[PDB]
């Protein structure tokens with residue numbers, strides 16, 4: 001697996017059990033394919049290593065989702081999302097199986113679904129009401145972001161069969177290979193980002209634009 005300093009440096013996994021658009025390091029991306037004669041082609045890579053069951057990742061997503069979406073709309077970053085199961089929680093496999101179905105069948109709603117799955121976790125942390133940390137809760141999150149019903153109907157079977165277990169295994173393999181220490185871990189243009197400097201909802205924007 002290429003070093004983080006290499007950025008987006010793998011081809012598609014092209015394997016059974018792994019979403020079709022996922023790369024060989026388990027990541028997936030937004031904004032990488034701009035034409036080279038466009039300002040959009042200058043979009044440097046922002047890599048985010050995360051676990052769906054990590055509270056720090058949930059907080060990160062809540063704080064930065066608006067500006068990450070804005071940076072993508074403004075064609076200022078290529079976003080690369082790198083999943084793992086560092087915390088060894090089965091919730092991560094549940095979410096990854098539902099996310100795999102979304103990636104494969106409703107990719108237009110994938111980034112919104114990512115946010116929504118983290119929102120479930122954030123709300124549970126705050127309230128101690130864990131009742132939505134289920135397949136049925138993810139179906140509801142998918143409806144909230146308008147994943148088609150025919151797609152979210154496939155979540156239970158994917159979860160029950162661990163359809164995307166190979167993807168979960170690959171994300172952990174990639175995280176280990178690169179000897180990363182915790183989640184989240186963020187790189188920008190291949191350089192480590194100090195998470196302690198990202199404490200506002202515009203802090204990634206400031207980093208990307210040089211302030």
Ligand SMILES: O=S(=O)(O)C[C@@H](O)CNC1CCCCC1
Pocket residue numbers: 021028029030031032033034103107108110
């Ligand atoms: O090449 S572009 O930058 O025009 C588009 C490219 O980022 C699309 N990638 C994701 C992949 C899987 C989830 C949905 C979109």
